[PDB]
């Protein structure tokens, strides 16, 4: 059957009993960088087994009045093993990504999530005259959650997290132009995103530039009749692909 995928990279594998097809970026596969394109004067390094394994963030609990969660992508892995080590020790770098979110339930629950990934996602502050601080944009391997209401004006540096505007002032119904996938609990069980490296510059520092952002928004509220399990989690699994580095300098 076509329902079964088998994803193996390095020393960790993910299998699932049923899931939909895998959506791969804008039509390309993540690759290494060719000699005609480079601008780093020095030879890069490729650990390529010590970085191309899977990692697991902190799971969040889907409730009835859940608004939605997000993560800044090449920042939440900054303590995740040797990738977190190698991010601290270099000046440049480019990575691919594979994203696999999974959430299971019985056939008696209802709900339909939306998982989309957005490149170059700016946010807006609560007060219009400022920009929010670093700690409100992302947590270390933890989710920042949306609100179904409007953040007030009296706050100094906080992110405006109204769901229907998605923090960028756009209509969330139009969000499907980015590579996305649906998780409908009636038929599907997990989603798979494969994303290539998207930037105007062939390499980048990872500490002061988040080039990818993952969002998860519940359109249909989670609903169930009485008697089932009320506590349902959502886990994500993130693995990089064909990463490399340059410019070995001290730890910071």
Tokens representing 163 are 């769901």
Q: Site for other proteins (CB under 8 A): how many residues? A: 87
Which residues touch 195 (CB under 8 Å, ≥6 apart)? 25, 30, 96, 97, 98, 99, 117, 179, 212
Span 124-143, contacts to other proteins by CB under 8 A: 124-125, 127-132, 134
107 binds other proteins (CB under 8 A): yes
Among 7, 9, 14, 22, binds other proteins (CB under 8 A): 22
Contact string 210-239 vs other proteins (x = CB under 8 A): xx-x----xxx--xxxxx------------
CB of 166 to other proteins, least distance (A): 9
173 binds other proteins (CB under 8 A): yes
Q: Toward other proteins, which CB reaches closer, 13 or 131? A: 131
Distance in angstroms (rounded) separating the CA atoms of residues 70 and 136: 12
Span 65-84, contacts to other proteins by CB under 8 A: none
Q: Toward other proteins, which CB reaches closer, 8 or 11? A: 8
| Cα 233 from chain centroid (whole Å) | 17
CB of 108 to other proteins, least distance (A): 6
Tokens representing 37 are 């394109």
Tokens representing 117 are 């990934």
Q: Toward other proteins, which CB reaches closer, 27 or 43? A: 27
Distance in angstroms (rounded) separating the CA atoms of residues 126 and 137: 13
32 binds other proteins (CB under 8 A): no
CB of 30 to other proteins, least distance (A): 10
Among 45, 59, 142, 150, binds other proteins (CB under 8 A): 150
Which residues touch 247 (CB under 8 Å, ≥6 apart)? 40, 42, 90, 91, 92
Tokens representing 114 are 């939306």
Span 47-66, contacts to other proteins by CB under 8 A: none
Distance in angstroms (rounded) separating the CA atoms of residues 200 and 95: 14
């Amino acid at each position: 059957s076509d329902r079964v995928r088998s994803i193996t990279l390095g020393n960790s594998t993910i299998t699932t009993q049923e899931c939909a097809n895998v959506v791969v970026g804008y039509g390309v596969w993540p690759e290494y960088l060719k000699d005609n394109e480079a601008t780093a004067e020095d030879q890069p390094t490729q650990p390529d087994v010590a970085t191309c394994r899977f990692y697991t963030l902190e799971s969040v609990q889907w409730m009835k009045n859940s608004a939605g969660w997000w993560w800044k992508l090449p920042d939440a892995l900054s303590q995740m093993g040797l990738f977190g080590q190698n991010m601290q020790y270099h000046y440049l770098g480019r990575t691919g990504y594979t994203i696999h979110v999974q959430c299971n339930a019985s056939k008696f629950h209802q709900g339909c999530l939306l998982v989309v990934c957005v490149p170059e996602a700016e946010m807006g502050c609560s007060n219009l005259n400022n920009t929010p601080e670093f700690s409100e944009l992302s947590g270390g391997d933890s989710a920042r959650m949306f609100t179904d209401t409007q953040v007030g004006e009296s706050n100094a540096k906080k992110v405006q997290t109204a769901v229907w505007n998605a923090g960028m002032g756009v209509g969330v119904g139009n969000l499907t132009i980015f590579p996305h996938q649906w998780i409908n609990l009636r038929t599907n069980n997990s989603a798979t995103l494969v994303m290539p490296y998207i930037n105007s510059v062939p390499m980048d520092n990872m500490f002061r530039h988040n080039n990818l952002t993952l969002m998860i928004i519940p359109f249909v509220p989670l609903n169930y009749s009485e008697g089932s399990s009320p506590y349902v989690p959502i886990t994500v699994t993130i693995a990089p692909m064909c990463a490399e580095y340059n410019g070995l300098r001290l730890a910071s």
